[PDB]
Structure 1
Amino acid sequence: NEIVVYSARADELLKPIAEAYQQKTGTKVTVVSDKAGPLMERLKAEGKNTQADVLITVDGGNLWQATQAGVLRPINSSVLKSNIPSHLRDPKNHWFGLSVRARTIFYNPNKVNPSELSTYADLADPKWKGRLCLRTSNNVYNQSLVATMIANHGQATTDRVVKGWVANLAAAPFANDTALLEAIDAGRCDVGIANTYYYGRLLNSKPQVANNVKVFFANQAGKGTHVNVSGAGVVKHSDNPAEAQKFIEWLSSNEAQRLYADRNFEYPANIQVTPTPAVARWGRFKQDFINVSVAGQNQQKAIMTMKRAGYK
């Protein structure tokens, strides 16, 4: 048989995934890749006549958007509920997180002692004036981070924090996380906020970046470090809902988690799968157990928050 996967991941990342599953089960896995928004806009337009069986997309913000658009169908999977922690999957069973990333603090260890660091909020402290760099607010990772900050600390507090962030900027917000991390390495930025897998990707290509850039896991005293996911769900109008579900259940297994998460320097979502050494080297940390669907529920508030704060 054959299944169709609409994927917002890097095309090279799913190619080994499709091959390993065809070798194990004989099922052909066709991958159609596009950006998350356009891909979901495609799935919504195709309706009942769609050829897609599985949607794989990035960030709980987008997974919540796809669920609100009605393009996913809830599935009852004992395998997925056991392999995937509850905070990393949709409460109404429409999607399941399969890799974990952290959005957290990075710093220049030649200029910043980790004892000076603690929380996202404390980055608004005036001691950071002229030392902070951020990636643009026009991005789902930052929308999702601020969405959880609103849920954890309230709207008024978060308004003050993000306004404090902007007042502390050493440079204009960067267009992507890798550019931010490189500007820390260049010495322009002393502290920043980014996704961990870009750091693993950057150290893989330029190992010397570690001299000027280290990771700090934020909010260890409170709720924990913000984590987010890439995840999958069965397309509502799939012609093969049973085989679509079997593929997603396989992705949560040990062997597939290594292929799915390790190659992109992300954490496995399955906690019985130990992270790849390059990732495990950064250390253990407490992660927030807020359900990551809150990243979507509070997305509009986060957008409004960053806009009122002058966070470009």
Structure 2
Amino acid sequence: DITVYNGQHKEAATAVAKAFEQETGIKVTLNSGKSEQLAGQLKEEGDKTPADVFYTEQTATFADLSEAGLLAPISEQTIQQTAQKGVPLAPKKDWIALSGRSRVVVYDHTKLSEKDMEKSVLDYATPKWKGKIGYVSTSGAFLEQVVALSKMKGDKVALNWLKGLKENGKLYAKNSVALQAVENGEVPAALINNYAWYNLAKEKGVENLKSRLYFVRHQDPGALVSYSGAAVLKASKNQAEAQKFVDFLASKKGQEALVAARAEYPLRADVVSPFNLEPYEKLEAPVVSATTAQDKEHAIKLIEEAGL
């Protein structure tokens, strides 16, 4: 039996754990928490941690653990299962990316069309969109979007984007609320994450929604994908079952279990999502370095400076 420190959503984690227990007969215990807190706990515990595997919604939390020598190597064959073009790879082959979530633009297709959409997420923060674009400044993915803009286009552009949202956008407390506002006719479009919309569409049927999704694609900062993954702890005294769990997560059945539970893009090429997601490769996600704590601190400073 194994212990998994879990920073991912409980439904994702519970569903793959249960499919693992059913496939192998090995029992999984989750120790859930926020990825950044769990990572800190793993570093403090060091070679006496009870953790066998670390399962996270955000692969960026792994870099520090790897650099501190706390992660075990994973099978090369396992890594290759999700190694699509654009998918982040552990330089030391000591963690694996498993799935993704995407930034998207949701729009009311009875008021706007694909033709009204912009080639860049930068352009939604301009007077053309005044009173017409919702955004969620408190959302973790929104913070990731600022980090990517900063890295890809520099601080002046990031700040100008945030200042433009301040001036032109409608602020919503959550992505689900921004989605409702589009459905309700309050705002014709918003910047959200993919899964909120695919959840609603699975629930109600796409034909019954006013809203559709526009993916900016072509490695625009607005095509940002955030990656979930897993790692085996070097300290684990059950490497064999820990590695079997990580291999299962990368397998067809493990990826099938994940996508049945959550609207994340599988990184295996031979699994389709029952939420009817497009293939990961079609997203044309940009390639961007892992968000550090320092990156998050800086992005918060820019949001503050923009008056948000």
Scaled to the shorter chain, the TM-score interval is 0.7 to 0.9
* Residues 103, 193 of structure 2: 8 Å contact kept: yes
> What aligned pairs does 1:1-312 form with structure 2 within 5 A after superposition?
2-64=1-63, 70=68, 72-85=70-83, 87-117=87-117, 118-136=119-137, 138-170=138-170, 172-174=171-173, 176-207=174-205, 211-220=209-218, 222=220, 225-276=223-274, 278-280=276-278, 285-291=282-288, 293-294=290-291, 298-311=295-308
* Residues 67, 94 of structure 1: 8 Å contact kept: yes
Change (3 A) 1:209 1:262: same
Change (3 A) 1:277 1:219: closer
Whole-angstrom CA distance in 1 between matches of 2:277 and 2:292? 24
Whole-angstrom CA distance in 2 between matches of 1:130 and 1:49? 54
* Residues 88, 269 of structure 1: 8 Å contact kept: no
Secondary structure at the aligned position of 2:276 is classed as helix
Measured on the aligned residues, the alpha-carbon RMSD in Å equals: 2.8
Unaligned 5+ runs, structure 2: none
* Residues 103, 222 of structure 2: 8 Å contact kept: no
* Residues 103, 223 of structure 2: 8 Å contact kept: yes
The residue type paired with residue 125 of structure 1 is T
Q: How much identity, in percent, do the aligned residues show?
A: 27
* Residues 6, 33 of structure 2: 8 Å contact kept: yes
Change (3 A) 1:131 1:71: farther
Change (3 A) 1:222 1:46: closer
Using the TM superposition, give the Cα deviation of residue 164 of structure 1 relative to its aligned residue in structure 2, in angstroms.
0.9
The residue type paired with residue 8 of structure 2 is R
Using the TM superposition, give the Cα deviation of residue 92 of structure 1 relative to its aligned residue in structure 2, in angstroms.
3.8
* Residues 103, 225 of structure 2: 8 Å contact kept: yes
Change (3 A) 1:90 1:198: farther
Using the TM superposition, give the Cα deviation of residue 62 of structure 1 relative to its aligned residue in structure 2, in angstroms.
4.0
1:176-203 Cα shifts (integer Å, max 9, x gaps): 2112211211222222111111211122
Change (3 A) 1:6 1:222: closer
Secondary structure at the aligned position of 1:19 is classed as helix
Unaligned 5+ runs, structure 1: none
